[PDB]
Structure 1
Amino acid sequence: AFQRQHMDSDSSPSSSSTYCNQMMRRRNMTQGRCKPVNTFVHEPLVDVQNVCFQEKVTCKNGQGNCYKSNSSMHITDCRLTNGSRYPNCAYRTSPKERHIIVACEGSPYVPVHFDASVE
C-alpha cells in the first residue's frame, strides 16, 4: 500500500493545480469517501527505501519502527477542500521540501507507512 498511497517519483506539482484531485482518485483514495489528508513523495523509490537505514526515531502513531530521512525530500500534501462533498472529492495541492518519517517492515525491509513530514 505504501507505493500506491505515497509514491510518485516522477511528478513535481505546483500549488493547487489539479494534481491532488487527479492523484487521490487515481490511487484509490476517494472510493466510498474522500480521504482527508495524504502525502506523496517525489523521490526515487530507492532513496525512500534507504530511509529505513537512516535515523531511527519514535513514531507519530502506532509503533512499527520509524526512521527519519537524513535529507529533506520533495513531497506534496493533499488536503480535502472545504466545499468538497463525496462523490465529488476536491483537494488543495501543497508542494513542500521536508524530512520524512516512515515505518518500515518486512523482508526486504522497506517503508510500509508514511508517519509524517518534519518541521
Structure 2
Amino acid sequence: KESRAKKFQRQHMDSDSSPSSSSTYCNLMMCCRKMTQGRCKPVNTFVHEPLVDVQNVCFQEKVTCKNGQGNCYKSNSSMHITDCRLTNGSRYPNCAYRTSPKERHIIVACGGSPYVPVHFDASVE
C-alpha cells in the first residue's frame, strides 16, 4: 500500500512552492493531495524545501516528539512552510482552509531504511 515515506511526501512536501497568505493554496493542495476525502483534515503542514534537504533533518538535532516520548529531529535551520487549518464554516464535503506561510524549524520522526522522515511532528521559532 502506501509507505510511510510516501505518505509523508504526499502530505507534507511541496518542494517547488511559494504560497500566498490566505490565497486558496491550502484549499486546493489539501484537496489535490487527498486530505479532504471522507473527512477534511483539520490541520496540515507543507514544506517548501528540497526533498533531500528535508530528508537530512533525520541526521540533525535530536529532540523529543510533541508527545514527550518519541525521538524526533529538529532541523538545524528554519525552512519555508505553510500551515493549513480548516475553517469553522467548513462542513464536509465543503472543506475550506486558512493558508499561513511562515519561516520555521521543523521537527519530524524518522525511520525505516533508508532512514527517512515518516511523520511531521511540529514547527518552531
User: Into which bin does the TM-score normalised by the smaller protein fall?
Assistant: over 0.9
Whether the aligned pair in 2 keeps the contact of 1:9 and 1:43 (CA below 8 Å) is: yes
Matched, 1:32 2:31: no
Partner Cα separation in structure 2 for residue 58 and residue 116 of structure 1: 11
Whether the aligned pair in 2 keeps the contact of 1:33 and 1:86 (CA below 8 Å) is: yes
* Secondary structure of the corresponding residue to residue 38 of structure 1: strand
Superposition RMSD in Å: 1.1
Whether the aligned pair in 2 keeps the contact of 1:5 and 1:27 (CA below 8 Å) is: yes
Whether the aligned pair in 2 keeps the contact of 1:64 and 1:105 (CA below 8 Å) is: no
| Counterpart mapping for 1:46-61 below 5 A | 46-61=52-67
Alignment equivalent of 2:74, drawn from 59, 68, 84: 68
Deviations along 1:4-36, one digit per CA (max 9) or x if unpaired, are: 000000011011111000000111111111110
Whether the aligned pair in 2 keeps the contact of 1:64 and 1:104 (CA below 8 Å) is: no
* Secondary structure of the corresponding residue to residue 63 of structure 1: coil
Deviations along 1:13-69, one digit per CA (max 9) or x if unpaired, are: 011111000000111111111110000000000100000001000111374420000
Relative to structure 1, the CA distance from residue 74 to residue 35 in structure 2 (aligned partners, 3 Å threshold; closer, same or farther) is same
Of 107-116 and 61-70, the range deviating more from structure 2: 61-70
Whether the aligned pair in 2 keeps the contact of 1:103 and 1:112 (CA below 8 Å) is: yes
Identity %: 96
Whether the aligned pair in 2 keeps the contact of 1:36 and 1:80 (CA below 8 Å) is: yes
* Secondary structure of the corresponding residue to residue 99 of structure 1: strand
Q: CA deviation at 1:111?
A: 0.2
Whether the aligned pair in 2 keeps the contact of 1:68 and 1:99 (CA below 8 Å) is: yes
- Scaled by the length of structure 1, the TM-score of the pair is 0.95
Partner Cα separation in structure 2 for residue 63 and residue 26 of structure 1: 33
Unaligned runs of 5+ in 1: none
* Secondary structure of the corresponding residue to residue 58 of structure 2: helix
Q: CA deviation at 1:83?
A: 1.1
Unaligned runs of 5+ in 2: 1-7
